[PDB]
Structure 1
Amino acid sequence: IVDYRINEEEFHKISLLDCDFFIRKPPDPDNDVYDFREMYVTPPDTDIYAIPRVLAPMPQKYIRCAMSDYGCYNVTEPPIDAPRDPMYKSEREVSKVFLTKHYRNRRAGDPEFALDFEEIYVIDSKTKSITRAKVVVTVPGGRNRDRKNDLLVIRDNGTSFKIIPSEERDDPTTVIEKEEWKKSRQDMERHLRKLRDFSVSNWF
């Protein structure tokens, strides 16, 4: 416990399902600048401040970044006790936040805006930790590859990051279909294993 109560007017507040994360805010016109030097984490909507677990090297200078949320919608049917009581309840439930460096600390307005996907930092709700991602650039072009034809694909619960060229992206149906095929195949085999003739059979 820090033992001092901070002024939160000077801190960015990011809210996750189980925690609130505070990072320092240097003044700027569009509110995009971040200091990773001071950070605190708090139980949800309560005000006893505490120091986060930092699992990686953190930046020592001001960085312009963009924030995104990762999570799952929860739709529940709640009990009905009055005539017009709500039939359904929906909650966002964010679990991780990804902060990505603007390129060369450039600003949105500039014609030259892009995002540096090499530097992405993650905040995790369950572990109260901040870490840096490991990206695998499979895009030829080297370190100098253009940043106007780059796309990042995140898979695996936020644990896999890759940069690939734009045109080689998969359509939305293919991603769903690929997954269903894998699961369905494994499940049929599990069923059919019990039969005494499995060793002598062929998938077709």
Structure 2
Amino acid sequence: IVDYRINEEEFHKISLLDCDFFIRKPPDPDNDVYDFREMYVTPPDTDIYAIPRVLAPMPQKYIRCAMSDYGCYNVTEPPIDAPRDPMYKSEREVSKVFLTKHYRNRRAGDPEFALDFEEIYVIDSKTKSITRAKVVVTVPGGRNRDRKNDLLVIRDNGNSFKIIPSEERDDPTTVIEKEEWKKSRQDMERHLRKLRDFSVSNWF
């Protein structure tokens, strides 16, 4: 606990499921400049500030980043105790926030604008920690690869980051069918294992 109440007007307020993250914002025309020198984490809608867990080397200079949100929608069924009581309740339930630095700190309105997928900072509400993501560049070109053709694939609950070309992508139907087929194969093998003839058998 810092024990002093900061002025949240000069900070970036990022809301999470169980936490609120504050990052100092330098004066800028477009609110996309972040200062990672001063940062605080608070309980949900609480004015008791604290120091977050810095688990990775944080940038010590002003950088222009793009915020994103990661989570799952919780569509519940609230009890109906009134005539016009709502039939459903939908919540975004953000879990991880991704900060993607702009290439060369360029503005969004510039003629050449690209996102630097090599410097990703994630924020976790469960662990109350901010760390730097580990990406696996696989696009040919090394460090001279053009940033106008890049695709960042995020899987495994925000733990796997890969940079692949834009043309080499899979449609949503493909990945959905892949995961469904994998789960179905695993469950079918689990079900058929208990049969006394599973040993002398063949999956066709």
Same structural fold, with TM-score higher than 0.5 when normalized by the shorter chain: yes
Q: C-alpha distance in 1, partners of 2:78/2:166?
A: 43
Secondary structure, counterpart of 1:200 in structure 2: coil
Q: Please report how far the alpha carbon of residue 172 of structure 1 lies from its aligned counterpart in structure 2 after TM superposition.
A: 1.2
In structure 2, the residue matched to 1:154 is 154
In structure 1, the residue matched to 2:109 is 109
What residue ranges of structure 1 are gaps of 5+ in the alignment?
none
Task: Kindly provide the CA deviation profile for residues 34-77 of structure 1, in whole angstroms up to 9, marking residues without a partner as x.
Answer: 00000000000010110000000000100000000000000111
Secondary structure, counterpart of 1:152 in structure 2: strand
Secondary structure, counterpart of 1:107 in structure 2: coil
In structure 2, the residue matched to 1:57 is 57
Secondary structure, counterpart of 2:191 in structure 1: helix
Secondary structure, counterpart of 1:95 in structure 2: strand
Q: Please report how far the alpha carbon of residue 185 of structure 1 lies from its aligned counterpart in structure 2 after TM superposition.
A: 0.4
Q: C-alpha distance in 2, partners of 1:189/1:32?
A: 50
Q: Please report how far the alpha carbon of residue 79 of structure 1 lies from its aligned counterpart in structure 2 after TM superposition.
A: 0.6
Q: C-alpha distance in 1, partners of 2:151/2:119?
A: 14
Secondary structure, counterpart of 2:9 in structure 1: helix
Task: Kindly provide the CA deviation profile for residues 63-105 of structure 1, in whole angstroms up to 9, marking residues without a partner as x.
Answer: 0000000000001111111111111110000000000000000
Q: Please report how far the alpha carbon of residue 123 of structure 1 lies from its aligned counterpart in structure 2 after TM superposition.
A: 0.5
Q: Please report how far the alpha carbon of residue 174 of structure 1 lies from its aligned counterpart in structure 2 after TM superposition.
A: 0.2
Instruction: Return the TM-score normalized by structure 2.
Output: 0.99
Q: Please report how far the alpha carbon of residue 142 of structure 1 lies from its aligned counterpart in structure 2 after TM superposition.
A: 1.1
- After superposing on structure 2, the runs of 4+ consecutive aligned residues of structure 1 that deviate more than 2 Å are none
Q: Please report how far the alpha carbon of residue 18 of structure 1 lies from its aligned counterpart in structure 2 after TM superposition.
A: 0.3
Task: Kindly provide the CA deviation profile for residues 168-189 of structure 1, in whole angstroms up to 9, marking residues without a partner as x.
Answer: 1001100100000000001111
Q: Please report how far the alpha carbon of residue 158 of structure 1 lies from its aligned counterpart in structure 2 after TM superposition.
A: 0.2
Q: Please report how far the alpha carbon of residue 3 of structure 1 lies from its aligned counterpart in structure 2 after TM superposition.
A: 1.1
Task: Kindly provide the CA deviation profile for residues 107-156 of structure 1, in whole angstroms up to 9, marking residues without a partner as x.
Answer: 01111100100000000000000000000000011101000011100000
Q: C-alpha distance in 1, partners of 2:97/2:24?
A: 16
Matched, 1:47 2:47: yes
Instruction: Return the TM-score normalized by structure 1.
Output: 0.99
What residue ranges of structure 2 are gaps of 5+ in the alignment?
none
In structure 2, the residue matched to 1:78 is 78
Q: C-alpha distance in 2, partners of 1:46/1:186?
A: 45
Secondary structure, counterpart of 1:142 in structure 2: coil
Secondary structure, counterpart of 2:203 in structure 1: coil
Secondary structure, counterpart of 1:183 in structure 2: helix
Q: C-alpha distance in 1, partners of 2:85/2:3?
A: 44
